[PDB]
């Protein structure tokens, strides 16, 4: 009962702790590198930092107010009272956060300008490159420019979740609804900006990752799904990479010894193709893609995988009724024969989570972060780089066969984790299930 409301508070904390460290990848670490190298024109430095710094200020103050209250929580008997309550802190900052919306609206403009600056300036591209290599850069650099607006959502989500196990009679009930309504209209205003950014980000990433392809980023192209399938060739079924956008189908070329597995071979426009499910090819889970002037047959790793790629193709071909010219997620797909949809991203993002838990040779306490379908391992809540990582596509959360332990299974790889509480136990295996 009362415990459930407290663990949400701690949830807000741990995640805010990770958020502030996320922001520090830019405002601390990336900043210095730009100064030491001065490959970034001052206009872009202003545009970048005039819009992240002020946000970072607020949050640093906010984390303080939180973790303090959280300390006064678990306190005398004639005061607590207002020690076991957080709706007041939230209500304040929420109605105070709305004043930063103007800053957020330009994140689509910062991710945009960095890109052009990177391509037209050769020195900055080099700098940018080496910096994404550093252990501090545990996710792609672009991914961080996203988190500010995404964080706004996470308050809406968490505040929502508080009004769930709350009812009239609690001191912190009237405040939360005012707070929730305050953040809900904050996210509303930027909901358009958010989706526009989340997509620009994915296109701007792929643009880099893939070799050969140019002009992939466009005001129109939305990303449907990326993933791995076996193209039918004269030598046999061969693994290849497919990237389905709203207006074409990108696929990967023949694998050469020592070359990239992510060189784009050609695209197949969506006007006007048909996909037709395959004969005794049914067991092979293959279907056939008749394009306007090329035709391919292709096998899915499993049956559901096929139905996904098909349903997504067909529904995308109907919906389409400068010219493209010729261990992240894309890599985890190549090594596990799977795919990830635009729908999955929004389900690994809404399911982000930080916390402390143990990991059985011999129970080992680590601080774990779950973003981007991947677990990141720290020894302290305060380190600036992950000690280890573990991507989770194709991992299944079950109980074994201590107390309150869940296990991750994948082929021969078996890991075990323990949470302190029992609520926080049902929450960890929850989010991992919702990013799978």
DSSP state string for 2-26 = HHHHHHHHHHHHHHHHHHHHHHHII
Tell me the two tokens of residue 140. 């792609």
Per-residue DSSP letters for 334-373?
A: HTTT-EEEHHHHHHHSTT-EEEEEEE----EEEEEEEETT
Dist. CA 190–CA 53, nearest whole Å: 19
Q: Cα separation of 278 and 52, whole Å?
A: 52
Structure tokens at 212: 């050969």
Give Cα separations from 64 to 59, 67, 71, 161, 327 (angstroms): 9, 5, 11, 22, 34
Query: Backbone phi, then psi, for 122, in 5-degree steps?
Result: -80, -30
Q: Which domains does the chain have, with CATH numbers?
A: 1-198 (1.20.900.10), 199-348 (2.30.29.30), 349-436 (2.30.29.30)
Compute how many other C-beta atoms are within 10 angstroms of the C-beta atom of residue 184. Answer: 14
Instruction: Please tell me the distance from the alpha carbon of residue 155 to that of residue 391, in angstroms, as a whole number.
Output: 25
User: CA-CA distance, 435 to 111, in Å (whole number)?
Assistant: 25
Cβ proximity of 162 and 88 under 8 Å: no
Q: How far apart are CA 75 and CA 81, in angstroms?
A: 9
Distance of CA 397 to the CA centre of its chain: 20
Distance (Å, whole) CA 231 – CA 398: 34
Give the strand pairing for 295-299 and 405-410: unpaired
The reported resolution of this PDB entry, expressed in Å, is 3.2
- Which of helix, strand or coil describes residue 58? helix
The owner of tokens 């407290």 is 6
Question: For 163-241, where are the alpha helices, taking DSSP H only?
Answer: 173-189, 191-209
Task: State the chain's maximal CA–CA distance in angstroms.
Answer: 81
Residue partners of 32: CB distance under 8 A and separation at least 6 = none
β-pair type (374-378, 388-391): antiparallel
Distance CA(257)–CA(250), nearest Å, equals: 22
If we measure between CA atoms, which residue out of 83, 81, 23, 80 comes closest to residue 54? 23
CA distance 252 to 275: 19
Burial class (CB in 10 A: 0-12, 13-18, 19+), 320: middle
> Which long-range contacts (C-beta less than 8 Å, at least 24 apart) are formed by 383-389?
384/21, 384/24, 384/29, 384/136, 385/135, 385/136, 385/138, 386/135, 386/138, 389/138, 389/327
d(CA 269, CA 292): 7
Q: What b/e readout covers 117-154, taking b as 16+ CB neighbours within 10 angstroms?
A: bbeebeebeebbeebeeeebbbbbbbbbbbbbbbbbbb
Q: Both tokens of residue 161?
A: 């979740």
HSE (CB half, 13 Å, CA atoms) of 205?
21
Contact partners, residue 248, CB within 8 Å, separation at least 6: 221, 267, 268, 269, 270, 324
Q: Please give the Cα distance from 89 to 103 (Å, whole number).
A: 22
- Residues in the chain, how many? 436
Please, which experimental method was used?
A: X-ray
Q: What is the DSSP letter of 325?
A: B
H-helix or E-strand containing 304? helix 303-319
Q: How far apart are the first and last CA of the chain?
A: 29
Between CA 146 and CA 194 the distance in angstroms is 8
Token look-up 């009812």 returns 167
Asked if 359 and 350 touch (Cβ cutoff 8 Å), the reply is: no
Q: Which distant-in-sequence residues (6+ apart) come within 8 Å of 244 by Cβ?
A: 223, 224, 225, 226, 250, 309, 312, 313, 316
Yes or no: say if 329 and 373 are a contact pair by the CB < 8 Å rule: yes
């Amino acid at each position: 009962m009362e415990d459930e409301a407290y663990f949400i508070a701690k949830e807000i904390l741990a995640t805010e702790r990770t958020y502030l460290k996320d922001l520090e990848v830019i405002t601390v670490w990336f900043r210095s590198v730009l100064i030491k190298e001065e490959a970034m024109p001052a206009a872009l430095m202003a545009l970048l930092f005039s819009n992240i710094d002020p946000v970072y200020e607020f949050h640093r103050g906010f984390l303080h107010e939180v973790e303090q209250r959280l300390a006064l929580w678990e306190s005398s008997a004639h005061l607590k009272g207002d020690h076991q309550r957080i709706g007041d802190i939230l209500l304040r900052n929420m109605r105070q956060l709305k004043e930063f919306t103007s800053y957020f609206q330009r994140h689509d403009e910062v991710l945009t300008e960095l890109e052009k600056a990177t391509k037209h300036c050769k020195k900055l591209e080099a700098v940018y490159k080496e910096f994404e290599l550093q252990k501090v850069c545990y996710l792609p650099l672009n991914t961080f420019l996203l988190k500010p607006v995404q964080r706004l959502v996470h308050y809406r989500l968490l505040l929502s979740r508080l009004c769930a196990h709350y009812s009239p009679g609690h001191r912190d009930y009237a405040d939360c609804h005012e707070a929730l309504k305050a953040i809900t209209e904050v996210t509303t205003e930027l909901q358009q900006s958010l989706t526009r950014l989340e997509n620009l980000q994915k296109l701007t990433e792929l643009q880099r990752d893939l070799v050969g392809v140019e002009n992939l980023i466009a005001p129109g192209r939305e990303f449907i799904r990326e993933g791995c399938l076996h193209k039918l060739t004269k030598k046999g079924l061969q693994q290849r990479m497919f990237f389905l956008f709203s207006d074409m189908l990108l696929y990967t070329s023949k694998s050469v010894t020592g070359a990239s597995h992510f060189r784009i071979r050609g695209f197949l426009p969506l006007r006007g193709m048909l996909v037709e499910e395959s004969n005794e090819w049914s067991v092979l889970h293959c279907f056939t893609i008749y394009a306007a002037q090329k035709t391919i047959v292709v096998a899915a790793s499993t049956r559901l995988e096929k139905e996904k790629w098909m349903q997504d193709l067909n529904a995308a071909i109907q919906a389409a009724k400068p010219p493209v010219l010729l261990n992240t997620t894309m890599h985890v797909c190549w090594y596990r024969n799977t795919s990830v949809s635009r729908a999955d991203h929004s389900a690994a993002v809404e399911n982000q989570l930080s916390g402390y838990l143990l990991r059985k040779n011999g129970w080992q306490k680590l601080w774990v972060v779950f973003t981007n379908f991947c677990l990141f391992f720290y020894k302290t809540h305060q380190d600036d780089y992950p000690l280890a990582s573990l991507p989770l596509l194709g991992y299944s959360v079950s109980l074994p066969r201590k107390d309150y332990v869940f296990k991750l299974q994948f082929k021969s790889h078996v890991y075990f984790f323990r949470a302190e509480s029992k609520y926080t136990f049902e929450r960890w295996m929850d989010v991992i299930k919702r990013a799978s």
